């Protein structure tokens, strides 16, 4: 399994093309614009290429996502050449010289030898995360249809609230948790959150926070420890940490686990009926690079990312003078974080179980899991 | 650049391979033994290929570090075949059929059918990171030859310790870091740290910790923000959460970023005699998956990886019935973190600046150079 | 530098994604239709992403090119499911049971499980070969602007023709080679292809042929010979043999240089003014797995690959039964091995001069080559 | 499936890394050690890691082949650094400044920056290719244990002689083909052959030739026609081209269909009791980029590669005056090509069939073939 996007924020449209899936996997241009509308959650989809009649070809399956505001941006956005002096007019072609800070402004101009930061964040921006999601979508059929996997996402701080590091919710709690504001899965935890949004936006100031994807009903055995690259975490870690505004990934209880005692870091196992069984997920599902069955857990740490207004001291690139940056989310990172998830798993899965269709990769699944049983 | 690890615990060698590494840095057999002895810090190197009197040739270096305890092993992890009968006597080839909590054992036996743990922890061990630190001193070389660019590490935390939040250290702090028996920069945490392990000596149990990596003097626009995947705290990110008991990972404040206001969460950039200048650096170097010039830090979450004697309870594989796991190091950790972090670095270096040969290679970091001081 | 295509030949339309090429090529949306337009000579445009104002943005580049067709297939090639009731009633949805020979439909259909080779050769036919024009447009506009080297073809033979052994032609001899009927260079050979293929049609038939690539201007040292992936001719060979119907590839003088005595095999190197200088081009500009300066030559062996009507047994997989199989281009082949040979030497340009845009990359060619002159 | 092989021809020992293959595949020291003795064939093996009493572990298998004129070359190929005026003293240290045509000698030192070729031509040299045969021989026993397939090779043509293009030897014409002194299926090519070697070896002359792997026993549906790079031919090509020597891949009947007409240019297909069945294999065993069941026919053209004494010239590069090239295998060349086979089907069989382990692999393979038959 491969994934790319393509598209600026302010081009004609977004392109995600994913290559590797098995054909005869049920996803259609519906589930993807109900994914769309989960990242648009918290406080125009056209299939390409790769299905057909709601079923996966085998080959690279291609999805555009139109912008809506493209009509204002044809001109200084377009592909082609431009009279110079037809956009010397143009107000909104005016070049962005004061790089914001925590941004990839300063950095890729240098990189890129651009005087004007536009094209880079064009391209950096977070709406590319959209195209994310739709290659997602297409991955998360595959875990659900393949696997019985479901992936989800709640919010465990925003600001200065305090975590919450009780339970995680199972798929079930999902329509209560897209319902919450501020995509929480406990309530005390919510209000919590919604007072610290409320004195921020009070104090015209942003927010970042903490998202834990959650992953239910893996087998043991995907990712691997035979080496660095093949454990299903740096996988994992590789794929959020990539995501827009990301700082840090956790699995399982993450840093919190740095500071315990080996006789209280570890989930101990038990005899039971169907396998062995577990008590506590300290681990988040995933030991020695591969899954053990548990419920997957993951960790994201955004930073605020949205620029506030005339408090960030900056530089104006032309001129070498102090200036201001101008300016231009932790629910919907969680959605994004899930859609990185799924996208990983659902590698591994066609890594360990192969298969060109569904029904081939699902009979490798089940005879992987009697042979588990026989054991 | 890319580089592969090779080697089982009690096998008779490791085997580091890098490719893709250009002609003309000088390492030795010297000082991949001296990078080995970092390792080896905290409370027999043969170059086969790649190398020709202390300067690399290019093509790929493979570098071998000998087992010291191979003739014991060499019935057990013998690579042919054995006489079963002659092996039945043998005591310490008797098969691990209780997976210790915590690691790979027990999702490696059911992931390759295995009925014994023994090859699952040969390769699993962390003694693999031996062979990583043989490929990251050909890494740090480059970057230190290159590009001027010096990598280190410290102690933030071992168990409950209270984290070293001051300023890292610069390169000319680290033979008193690498003296100290935490490796700890600052003298109030590090007996913080020393009283933390001998409480957990005492009590017979196990520490993990928090380890900073530092890296000094890169370039701007080192990654690149086009994708997820270029985004250099994506890459460092797969390269240090892969290492052997890491279950967490953060770019220079990380998760307390999140707990943060964007007023206070970003790096503001100020006017400077050679290029902009920054005060602060919560960062960590890195912006929208690009060097910006400040020192990059890399954070890792160690859990205590040594199992405690009779505390964990586990199954026996062979039975079904409740067992105790039978067992079978932060400083060291933050060793590891360092080579990562120089291969990363290395390959997004040669990535950027391509050419074949390190004079080729420093032509054009020059001239890059010379276009962004004339900017 | 990778690229990517999706689409189906009668799906909405085709997409090209090229990922890792510099900003700062200048590259329209007229220019890769005047490629699409070459590969249509022999006897709808949209650029979505990663270009701006004619000029490349460093991020993907998305290009689409849209089917003509797509209102007669837009029920069959629905990405969305149909009631199956609308759709039995529709003749040209039914099934293709009785698979080519000589094409992808019964290895792809057992493969994949499908009863229908509908969508395998959806996917496999050629039309996909325009999506790979579009990215090869790219490559060859960085080729042109960062080294001055120019990529062409013409036929060698058609059907039973004399081979043109004369030399190869060069960029000024492109427009007569494409106003060629086959795109021959030599007018002796022009005349026998044409013949070849007269006396084809008149008997139904169906012919296949060969066609060599040229790329002219490359400087030394492209590709490696340190390892088998890294060799230019590796690659060469990987990209053309892709190709649909091609059979076989050759570097220069190929198969007859391994009928040939070593006294008179290879290209003989003498003194000149500006660097060595050979008189025979056996080889064809690649030794060792580089590019030695010399023109750059690659033929590949294109099978016929229209089936012939009524003159192919074949199986009707839906019943056992014999059937016939039922249908459904050597100068065009020729502009397509163009393209992947432009692809790969971009690629293998961007790994030995590295940079993020093509000022740097020009900077390091120029600095190459001076090094070069000065020994 | 990753290889990587290592060594320089006078270094200290070569090593081969193959990296993905699954446990409990039986390969042993002793088969690696008779496919080097086949590869000797023509007019100390140490398995360092991933193996276990004759039996894959799953992790990266490393194993090192000793260079017995080491102790020879221990100073002027040392990795440490020597005294240069040591150096200066010792004959064999002499550089060199003369590239031989037809070699990576010139292209190799301009693209390294190198004054001498020794860097060069210690990797260059077709040594190397004792490292492909030791990764080779664990992909082959894989290929047999878990597909029951067979790979081999003969000899085409060697110099002028006339193409042998009778029918492809079976597995059992293996001993025959092997005691050939150039490995010809044939007798009387193999006359012809004899007698071409003769007359070039009394005119102190070099020949190349054509060579051609078998493979036996592939299931249908192996490599993809979704994309240039999943088509195995594609994948084939770039693993044989990229052999030193090889001038040319073709498959099946290559070069020569493309001179015939499509009616008799195919292999047409017939019922048979356990699936379809053909009467002609001028595909190959690929169409459309996948393995059809038929023989796998892939053929190398080698050109002549041991330089003839004081007949080429070249240029000194230390001077820019005129010099001679001064000097330093048909049927190895073929043995090379199976490796390099097997090495590739090994890799496209684990893509399709998955799994961890031989059993696992065997399982779905087992399924697939199943599934198959009850079409």
Known sequence: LRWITAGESHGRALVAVVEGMVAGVHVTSADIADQLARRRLGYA??????????????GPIAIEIGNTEWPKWETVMAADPVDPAELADVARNAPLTRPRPGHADYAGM??????????????????????????????????????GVEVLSHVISIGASAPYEGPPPRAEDLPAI???????????????????????????????????????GLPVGLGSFTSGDHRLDSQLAAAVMGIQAIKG???????????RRGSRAHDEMYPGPDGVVRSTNRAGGLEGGMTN????????????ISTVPRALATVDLATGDEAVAIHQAVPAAGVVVETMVALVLARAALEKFGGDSLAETQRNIAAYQRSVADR
């Open 293 to 304: 069955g548990q419920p997957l857990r993951v960790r994201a740490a955004m930073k605020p």
């Open 249 to 259: 990934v956790e699995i399982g209880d993450g840093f919190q686990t740095a500071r």
């Open 178 to 216: 897209d319902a919450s504001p501020v995509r929480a899965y406990d309530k005390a935890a919510e209000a919590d959150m919604i007072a610290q949004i409320e004195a921020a936006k009070k104090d015209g100031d942003t927010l970042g926070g903490v998202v834990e994807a959650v992953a239910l």
């Open 110 to 147: 240098l990189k890129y030898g651009f005087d004007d930061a536009r094209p880079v964040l064009e391209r950096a921006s977070a709406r590319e995360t959209a195209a994310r999601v739709a290659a997602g979508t297409v991955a998360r059929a595959f875990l659900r249809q393949a696997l």
């Open 45 to 58: 989809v056209t299939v390409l290429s790769g299905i057909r009649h709601g079923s996966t070809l085998g």
